[PDB]
Amino acid sequence: FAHADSELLNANYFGHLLRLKIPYITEVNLMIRKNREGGELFQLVLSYLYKMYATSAQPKWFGSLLRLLICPWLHMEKLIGEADPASTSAEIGWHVPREQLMGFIPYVSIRAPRLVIEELMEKNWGQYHAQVIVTDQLVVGEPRRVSAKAVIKGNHLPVKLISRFACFTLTSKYEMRTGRGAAYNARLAFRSD
């Protein structure tokens, strides 16, 4: 999230820039909420400061993001549903060779019908290279995990490289299945069943 337009532009943010608004009156929201930690009118003044700090570009109707977020997934279960969880799902992620001294972090996760993931087994996932720093302790009651850090070197992933027929998640943290870890020239690996 970001308050103003220029807050993501003066800081050299990398990513898709989305200018959004909701159909509500944002002003009278600022008088309903207590526990605001300061002046209750001061935050309305601070809202005006951010509204004037931004550039004069037209925002684009928060439903334009929310339909992308919900509606492909809801349409997916009407035809992917109860085929098999083993062979409708697949995941993209970075792959390190086994020859290490003391691995597959996930990048996206794809759910599709059988023919689509069979069409996803080709379209080779080389020409994509990162540098994975992988060193952490186990943190939660789920199995062995190390919160790694991957920095993509080459070009980023096109969407028509994936499909028009296969839904995929948009956000993901990084972890792999003790010891240490250093800079590894990782590559991608499409796994499925």
Partner: peptide, 24 residues
């Protein structure tokens, strides 16, 4: 390429109309 201009007097949101496509 990390510097940026600072606009001490920006032009207000009243002095624009809605978009003609992608242009106000």
């Amino acid at each position: 390429y990390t510097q940026s201009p600072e606009i001490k007097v920006p032009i207000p949101q009243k002095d624009w109309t809605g978009p003609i496509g992608e242009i106000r």
